[PDB]
Amino acid sequence: RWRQTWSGPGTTKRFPETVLARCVKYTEIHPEMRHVDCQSVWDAFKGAFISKHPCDITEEDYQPLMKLGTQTVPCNKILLWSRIKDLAHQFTQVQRDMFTLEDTLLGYLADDLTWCGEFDTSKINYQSCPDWRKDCSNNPVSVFWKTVSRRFAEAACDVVHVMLDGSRSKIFDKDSTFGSVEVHNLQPEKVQTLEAWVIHGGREDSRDLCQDPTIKELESIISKRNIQFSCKNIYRPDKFLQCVKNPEDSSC
Numbered sequence: 001r002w003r004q005t006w007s008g009p010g011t012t013k014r015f016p017e018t019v020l021a022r023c024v025k026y027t028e029i030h031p032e033m034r035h036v037d038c039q040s041v042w043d044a045f046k047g048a049f050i051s052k053h054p055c056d057i058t059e060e061d062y063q064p065l066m067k068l069g070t071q072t073v074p075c076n077k078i079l080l081w082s083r084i085k086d087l088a089h090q091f092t093q094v095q096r097d098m099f100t101l102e103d104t105l106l107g108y109l110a111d112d113l114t115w116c117g118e119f120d121t122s123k124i125n126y127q128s129c130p131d132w133r134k135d136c137s138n139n140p141v142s143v144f145w146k147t148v149s150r151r152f153a154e155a156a157c158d159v160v161h162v163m164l165d166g167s168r169s170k171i172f173d174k175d176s177t178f179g180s181v182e183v184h185n186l187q188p189e190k191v192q193t194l195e196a197w198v199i200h201g202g203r204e205d206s207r208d209l210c211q212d213p214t215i216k217e218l219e220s221i222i223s224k225r226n227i228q229f230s231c232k233n234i235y236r237p238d239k240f241l242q243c244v245k246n247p248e249d250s251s252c
Contacts, residue, residue: 006054006135011126012113019045019153022109033071033105038104041068045109048140053119054129055136057143066147069106073099075190077160082178083165087237091163098161101152105238110148111138116140149177153185159193160186162202166216167201172214183218188226197229209233 004010005018012018023038044064049057079098081088092098099109117137130139162178164171173179184195196218198209209215210231219229232242243252 006128029247050117054116078156080162153182155237166198172218193228
């Protein structure tokens with residue numbers, strides 16, 4: 001074909017093998033998931049989207065998979081992020097000070113992957129998948145992230161942290177998974193504070209981006225949910241990471 005059905009990239013090559021391998025690796029490393037049957041996880045993941053129209057996926061489709069990937073997360077150590085996932089991951093990798101969604105079995109399985117099927121065939125579509133904007137929001141990938149992110153947000157307690165990209169025109173973006181799902185699913189009964197770390201992209205002596213209009217928006221939203229809001233600038237994320245690996249003895 002010189003023209004594909006959908007406007008988005010197709011399913012990641014060797015999707016089935018990749019998810020299965022990730023499940024095996026995760027369950028080998030993480031002791032609480034030692035007992036998960038990875039074939040069963042693949043079957044349930046597959047059942048969510050195979051033979052279904054990829055513009056008609058619902059959260060219910062992923063419920064078998066959600067049940068299987070049920071997992072306790074230290075509720076007071078959750079790190080959310082938007083448009084800055086590499087630094088979030090590099091940070092949690094140092095000494096596991098916090099946990100992101102990609103530290104969970106389900107987030108790990110799907111990170112950086114694309115997948116979709118076809119109505120009334122059992123084939124995976126490796127040629128194209130729906131674009132969230134051009135085609136439809138109710139596609140297998142978008143629906144998966146909304147489903148898993150909601151559950152992750154509901155599990156948070158105490159002080160919840162979020163890394164935001166301060167080099168974006170919208171540092172807080174109401175359209176992101178963070179802004180459209182996670183903010184609205186933190187449980188005010190459990191969550192005391194949301195603390196945002198605004199990651200600078202700048203060359204040095206930049207603005208206090210905690211005063212950014214979009215940050216004030218996030219503050220208003222979260223305050224009105226009866227959760228406290230805190231914000232900090234991270235001016236030099238390279239120094240930040242160094243200080244995380246090697247604190248207090250040098251210039252930190």
